[PDB]
Amino acid sequence: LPFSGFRLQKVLRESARDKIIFLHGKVNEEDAVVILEKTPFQVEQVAQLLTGSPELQLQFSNDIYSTYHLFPPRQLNDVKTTVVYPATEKHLQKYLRQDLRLIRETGDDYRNITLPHLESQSLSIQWVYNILDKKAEADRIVFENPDPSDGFVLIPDLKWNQQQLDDLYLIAICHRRGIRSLRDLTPEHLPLLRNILHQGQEAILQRYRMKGDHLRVYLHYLPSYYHLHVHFTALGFEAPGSGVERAHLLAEVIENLECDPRHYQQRTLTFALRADDPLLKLLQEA
Amino acid sequence: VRLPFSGFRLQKVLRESARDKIIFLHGKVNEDAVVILEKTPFQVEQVAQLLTGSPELQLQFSNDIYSTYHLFPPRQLNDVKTTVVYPATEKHLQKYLRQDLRLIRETGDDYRNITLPHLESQSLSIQWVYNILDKKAEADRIVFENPDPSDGFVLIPDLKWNQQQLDDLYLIAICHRRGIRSLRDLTPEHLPLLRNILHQGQEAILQRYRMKGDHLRVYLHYLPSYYHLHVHFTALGFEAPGSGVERAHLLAEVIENLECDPRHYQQRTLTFALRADDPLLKLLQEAQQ
Ligand SMILES: C[C@H](Oc1cccc2nc(N)nc(N)c12)c1cccc(Cl)c1
Numbered sequence: 001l002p003f004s005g006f007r008l009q010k011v012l013r014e015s016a017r018d019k020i021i022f023l024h025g026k027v028n029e030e031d032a033v034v035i036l037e038k039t040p041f042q043v044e045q046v047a048q049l050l051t052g053s054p055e056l057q058l059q060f061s062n063d064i065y066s067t068y069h070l071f072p073p074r075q076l077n078d079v080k081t082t083v084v085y086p087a088t089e090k091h092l093q094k095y096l097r098q099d100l101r102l103i104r105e106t107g108d109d110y111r112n113i114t115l116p117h118l119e120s121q122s123l124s125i126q127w128v129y130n131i132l133d134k135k136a137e138a139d140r141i142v143f144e145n146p147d148p149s150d151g152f153v154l155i156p157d158l159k160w161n162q163q164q165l166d167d168l169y170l171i172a173i174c175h176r177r178g179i180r181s182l183r184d185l186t187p188e189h190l191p192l193l194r195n196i197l198h199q200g201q202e203a204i205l206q207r208y209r210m211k212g213d214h215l216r217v218y219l220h221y222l223p224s225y226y227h228l229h230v231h232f233t234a235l236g237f238e239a240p241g242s243g244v245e246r247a248h249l250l251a252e253v254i255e256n257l258e259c260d261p262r263h264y265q266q267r268t269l270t271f272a273l274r275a276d277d278p279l280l281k282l283l284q285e286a
Numbered sequence: 287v288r289l290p291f292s293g294f295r296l297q298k299v300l301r302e303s304a305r306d307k308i309i310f311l312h313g314k315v316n317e318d319a320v321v322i323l324e325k326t327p328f329q330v331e332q333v334a335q336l337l338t339g340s341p342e343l344q345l346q347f348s349n350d351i352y353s354t355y356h357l358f359p360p361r362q363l364n365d366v367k368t369t370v371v372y373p374a375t376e377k378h379l380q381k382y383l384r385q386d387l388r389l390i391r392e393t394g395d396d397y398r399n400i401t402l403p404h405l406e407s408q409s410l411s412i413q414w415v416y417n418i419l420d421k422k423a424e425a426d427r428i429v430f431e432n433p434d435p436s437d438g439f440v441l442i443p444d445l446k447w448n449q450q451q452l453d454d455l456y457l458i459a460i461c462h463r464r465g466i467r468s469l470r471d472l473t474p475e476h477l478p479l480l481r482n483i484l485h486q487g488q489e490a491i492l493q494r495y496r497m498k499g500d501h502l503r504v505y506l507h508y509l510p511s512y513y514h515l516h517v518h519f520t521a522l523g524f525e526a527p528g529s530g531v532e533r534a535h536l537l538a539e540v541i542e543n544l545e546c547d548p549r550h551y552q553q554r555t556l557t558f559a560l561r562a563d564d565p566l567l568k569l570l571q572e573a574q575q
């Protein structure tokens with residue numbers, strides 16, 4: 001570990017449906033968050049196991065149906081474990097199970113209400129700039145268009161353990177700073193977006209033998225961090241924020257800007273917000 | 287402590303969900319078996335103390351204050367819930383099978399030239415839909431109605447929703463007007479209807495179920511499962527299959543698109559997913575190659 005003597009203070013989030021868990025613990029005795037998530041199945045290896053002598057324990061049996069506790073070999077018991085140390089309060093509040101409400105932000109709402117409250121925050125995204133300057137993860141990079149204006153870095157998302165194509169998930173992070181979200185896009189960025197769309201899908205083709213029509217390529221709004229980035233995901237993966245209330249198809253973002261240059265500055269956008277988020281009351285009123 | 291058959295061998299992955307950590311496997315034996323494996327929820331106390339003493343952690347990478355590891359925990363945290371169906375009936379194979387999809391980007395021209403012709407070459411029955419509108423079935427279950435035959439609709443719970451809990455709330459708005467096969471048919475002429483469904487249908491869900499409109503995902507499907515305009519109302523906290531960006535279009539935006547661009551849904555490119563063995567997928571893939 002990057003510390004010793006972990007002691008649970010609080011379960012921040014726990015889902016039996018996603019078999020994922022977020023733990024807040026005190027360490028070195030500082031705050032630390034450890035995320036743990038049971039990994040996806042590897043089909044070839046489950047297949048193999050099931051035609052061997054697997055260690056089973058019989059729960060119940062009714063005619064053609066039977067339930068068993070299976071205890072696989074080490075290979076198939078991998079648990080994705082991510083660690084945040086030192087954890088900020090932003091982290092400790094961010095994961096707390098809180099209820100989600102839907103808001104409809106107009107163009108003017110954004111610039112007069114959101115953007116100011118955005119600027120009222122100071123969140124660290126040093127890890128993004130680290131990827132962009134080759135200060136970290138440099139040799140995980142899958143593809144780079146190195147132009148400071150129209151260029152980007154294609155790289156697997158931390159979420160993806162890269163052990164199977166079912167949950168294929170890369171991000172494309174643009175080199176250009178100062179583009180916080182969908183709200184910043186204009187016809188100026190059409191070349192950056194096309195690069196990400198086409199060069200990004202071409203890289204996935206050659207690297208992983210995965211055709212564009214197996215991918216859902218989108219942007220989050222609101223994003224989890226405020227530096228433009230595109231999500232490349234397996235169409236068959238229920239990826240994070242691929243629901244209509246958050247995901248915007250890249251191809252659609254391009255053709256929008258082509259049809260209506262002010263599109264993402266003028267148009268009303270719908271997204272969720274946590275009820276504990278002060279942005280909501282600020283948007284609800286004005 | 288053994289499987290009731292021999293020599294498992296994969297025919298087909300009927301279904302997998304990397305997000306739920308669950309796979310449905312069709313395998314042969316010796317004839318047909320289905321094996322369902324689900325990774326199990328964490329026992330938190332086990333994990334807790336483990337992290338205080340010699341966890342088999344292998345680092346994958348790190349960046350700033352973040353690091354990701356492979357953890358291989360001891361046996362009683364590795365339990366996998368294994369359900370087995372032997373023999374698997376052809377029904378069982380049909381129920382679990384989720385077919386591999388493929389994205390298509392359908393242009394206005396592609397639709398008119400390829401998709402509509404194909405749609406018209408079939409006979410899909412919406413008698414069940416007409417019976418609700420006509421009040422020959424499920425009249426007992428209607429939550430709200432705007433009986434106008436042009437801009438009116440019926441709001442009705444979906445089959446899947448038993449109404450014992452608002453967690454998985456799922457109502458459907460079916461418009462009275464006929465001949466609107468999908469999004470592709472929507473022009474500004476339909477805005478009173480669309481606004482009605484949205485504004486009255488939401489109003490109605492607040493009045494009836496005391497559930498506010500900002501707790502609702504309100505959306506259309508494209509492609510739709512039956513070709514008579516309908517709108518899904520679901521509890522936001524409940525991600526119904528279909529709510530994905532590759533299928534769902536929100537009612538709020540569909541309305542505003544028509545306000546901005548009247549020809550939007552006859553003229554723009556729509557993106558959906560078809561089953562990999564859908565004669566329409568092929569057809570479309572040909573006219574684009
Ligand atoms: C979204 C962000 O993700 C990352 C953080 C650091 C390095 C990352 N490196 C890569 N390649 N891809 C990512 N998504 C990375 C993040 C923030 C807080 C917790 C967690 Cl679990 C994830």
Ligand SMILES: C[C@H](Oc1cccc2nc(N)nc(N)c12)c1cccc(Cl)c1
Nearest residue numbers: 414415424442443444445446458511512
């Ligand atoms: C798609 C079709 O949908 C319906 C068919 C008949 C009555 C329906 N009534 C309601 N309220 N809502 C629906 N979606 C209905 C259908 C076909 C086979 C099984 C099932 Cl579970 C559903």
